[PDB]
C-alpha cells in the first residue's frame, strides 16, 4: 500500500516537470492568480483612501 501509492504520485511528478504543455498551462494559472490579487489590490487602494476621506472631513469639521 505504501509501495503503490508512491508509484502513482511520483510518476505523476515525472510527467509534471517534463511536459511543456503542462508548464505552459501552469504558468498562466498563476497569471490568473495574479489577476485576482491585482484586482484585490485595485479594490484595496480605493478602500484605504476611503480611510482618510472621513478623516479629512473630520479634521475640517
Amino acid at each position: 500500500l505504501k509501495r503503490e501509492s508512491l508509484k502513482d504520485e511520483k510518476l505523476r511528478q515525472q510527467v509534471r516537470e517534463n511536459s511543456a504543455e503542462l508548464r505552459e498551462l501552469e504558468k498562466k494559472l498563476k497569471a490568473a492568480y495574479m489577476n485576482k490579487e491585482r484586482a484585490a489590490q485595485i479594490a484595496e487602494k480605493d478602500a484605504i483612501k476611503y480611510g482618510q476621506m472621513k478623516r479629512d472631513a473630520e479634521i475640517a469639521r
Partner: protein
C-alpha cells in the same frame, strides 16, 4: 488527467480572472462548474 486534476483544483476559484488558452476543446467546461458562463 494531469491537466484534469490541475484544472479541477486551480481553476474553480478563478472564474472571471481566467487567461486565454486554458479551456481548449469546449467539453472541458462541461465537466466543471454548473453555470460557469465560460
Amino acid at each position: 488527467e494531469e491537466r484534469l486534476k490541475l484544472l479541477k483544483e486551480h481553476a474553480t476559484k478563478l472564474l472571471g480572472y481566467l487567461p486565454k488558452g486554458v479551456f481548449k476543446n469546449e467539453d472541458d467546461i462541461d465537466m466543471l462548474g454548473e453555470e460557469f458562463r465560460k
